[PDB]
């Protein structure tokens, strides 16, 4: 298992525009298109990302290319973030995959706001952090996924994904 496989499980794969758990237009492997209520705005954004007139539909290869770019940007965002980088660098490989999933889902800004869990993860206080992470709107809104990611930070293994 790796970050790619991990997020493909968490996000699924859809080739037609769809709404995500917050009702926003997305496509692919969780590639958010826009926060706008306008389906045309979403279609415009999709055509721009793909570089062709998609008419709301893409291929698996195109979904995978956007997925690659999104994982990349997520990592890069972490590395450039003064609040994130030091934490991520102190983590082992498994846990880092957990941090990327979070940033992938809620953004850099969003994750940078978990000040307390962040410090606990830097200190290797696994159980404590898992309890703090769960006290969040993130967990109450998407509890099955939050639990998987939380277990991954807690244990440092992929058990939650097998
Ligand atoms: Cl894009
Ligand atoms: Cl969920
Ligand atoms: Kr992090
Ligand atoms: Kr994190
Ligand atoms: Kr976090």
Curated annotation (Swiss-Prot):
Changing residue 117 to V: 50-fold decrease in enzymatic activity. It comes from Enterobacteria phage T4. PANTHER family: T4-TYPE LYSOZYME 1-RELATED. HAMAP family: ENDOLYSIN_T4 (MF_04110). Disulfide bonds: none annotated. This is Endolysin. The keyword Hydrolase applies. Changing residue 117 to I: 500-fold decrease in enzymatic activity. One of its GO terms (molecular function) is lysozyme activity.
């Amino acid at each position: 298992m790796n970050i790619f496989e991990m997020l493909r499980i968490d996000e699924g794969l859809r080739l037609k525009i769809y709404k995500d758990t917050e009702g926003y237009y997305t496509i692919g492997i969780g590639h958010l298109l826009t926060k706008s209520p306008s389906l045309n705005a979403a279609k415009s954004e999709l055509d721009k990302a793909i570089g062709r007139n998609t008419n709301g539909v893409i291929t698996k290869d195109e979904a995978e290319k956007l997925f690659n770019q999104d994982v990349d940007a997520a990592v890069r965002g972490i590395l450039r973030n003064a609040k994130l980088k030091p934490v991520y660098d102190s983590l082992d490989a498994v846990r880092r995959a957990a941090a990327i999933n979070m940033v992938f889902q809620m953004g850099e800004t969003g994750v940078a706001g978990f000040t307390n869990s962040l410090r606990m993860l830097q200190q290797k206080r696994w159980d404590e952090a898992a309890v703090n992470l769960a006290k969040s709107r993130w967990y109450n809104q998407t509890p099955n996924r939050a639990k998987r990611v939380i277990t991954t930070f807690r244990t440092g293994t992929w058990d939650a994904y097998k």
